[PDB]
């Protein structure tokens, strides 16, 4: 912890090449600084580091299921419907993105573009080239390689043999102006990594994990029909709530803009939302630490859909909590999570 980052503000890190080499050790280090308390962090990599030599050979890359984003609502409360469109290349996507109809409006400060977004998000539905299976990293890149991070999340594939797309495999996201990502935590309350490869920025909104229940209570009051049908209806990723609506109901939050060549980290039970400024490309996957195991055991999942991501927590409890295995199996494990506490791997930084 309550001493480090007591204001729960987003923190930016500038590691050296030596500090940047070990992924998990840096995640543990930034938690010893109190970064997890905001639910989101920014990491600027060393200037010498490059994951790919050039982005000039990706026009023939196929986006199998691009989505037209239809937004409905008023007074800072919205519902986003994602409509599947036919397959298109990155060349076909860039032409539409940069066309007069879908291009970024003229602006001075970010506050002006942010005002423009919340005023126009229901008009001219844009196309989002989201959830594309793939990587833009070169095979030889060993530092922060999204396709092979080497965290404890590797146990799900190593022992079960289970492959979950976007969770333990990389996803690419081709954006344009006004394309959004609704309010959500990660599947099973995992962490996530987001690298922006090139193009226009991506802006983010975050709610601290310790205040996450307050956002859930507010969303349930605004969409009571959605709450009755599904316990975790926010996992459907359809709800847009503006920063003015958050401020009105006393929900604490912070904002941040990610530029090309920067990393964003999301922490367990960290609610986040945002939008793209214009044409770009991002890479994303999920990861875990020893701190996540308790969040995964207590994650409230979607009940109405049968395709949803659910991980067997058994393998993590057997290896990391052998003393609690019988207690947890009998349902006698009644552990209360402390969101301010850092991962046990942060021991060497104290």
């Amino acid at each position: 912890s309550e001493t480090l980052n007591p204001s729960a503000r987003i923190m930016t890190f500038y590691p050296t090449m030596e500090e940047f080499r070990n992924f998990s050790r840096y995640i543990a280090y930034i938690e010893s600084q109190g970064a997890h308390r905001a639910g989101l962090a920014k990491v600027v990599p060393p200037k010498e580091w490059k994951p790919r030599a050039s982005y000039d050979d990706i026009d023939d890359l196929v986006i199998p299921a691009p989505i037209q984003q239809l937004v409905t609502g008023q007074s800072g409360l919205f519902t986003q419907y994602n409509i599947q469109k036919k397959a298109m290349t990155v060349r076909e996507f860039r032409k539409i993105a940069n066309s007069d109809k879908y291009c970024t409006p003229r602006y001075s400060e970010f506050e002006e573009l942010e005002r423009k977004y919340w005023k126009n998000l229901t008009f001219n539905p844009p196309i989002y080239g989201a959830d594309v299976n793939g990587t833009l990293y070169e095979k030889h890149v060993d530092e922060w390689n999204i396709g092979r991070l080497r965290t404890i999340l590797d146990l799900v594939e190593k022992e079960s043999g289970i492959t979950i797309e976007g969770v333990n495999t990389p996803y690419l996201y081709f954006g344009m102006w006004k394309t959004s990502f609704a309010w959500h935590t990660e599947d099973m309350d995992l962490y996530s990594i987001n690298y922006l490869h090139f193009g226009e920025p991506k802006s983010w909104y975050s709610v601290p994990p310790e205040h996450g229940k307050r956002l859930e209570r507010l969303a349930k009051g605004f969409f009571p029909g959605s709450a009755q049908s599904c316990e975790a209806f926010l996992r459907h990723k359809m709800t847009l709530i503006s920063p003015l609506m958050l401020k009105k109901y006393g929900i604490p939050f912070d904002k941040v803009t990610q530029e090309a060549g920067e990393f964003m980290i999301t922490f367990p039970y960290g609610y986040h939302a945002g939008f793209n400024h214009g044409f770009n490309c991002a890479e994303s996957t999920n990861f875990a630490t020893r701190r996540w195991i308790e969040y995964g055991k207590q994650a409230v999942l979607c009940s109405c859909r049968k395709d949803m991501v659910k991980i067997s927590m058994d393998v993590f409890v057997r290896k990391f909590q052998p003393e609690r295995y019988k207690l947890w199996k009998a349902g006698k494990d009644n552990t209360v999570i402390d969101h301010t506490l850092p991962t046990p791997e942060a021991a060497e930084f104290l």
Partner: peptide
């Protein structure tokens, strides 16, 4: 299973 953007 599969990670999604919803809608």
């Amino acid at each position: 299973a599969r990670r999604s953007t919803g809608g």
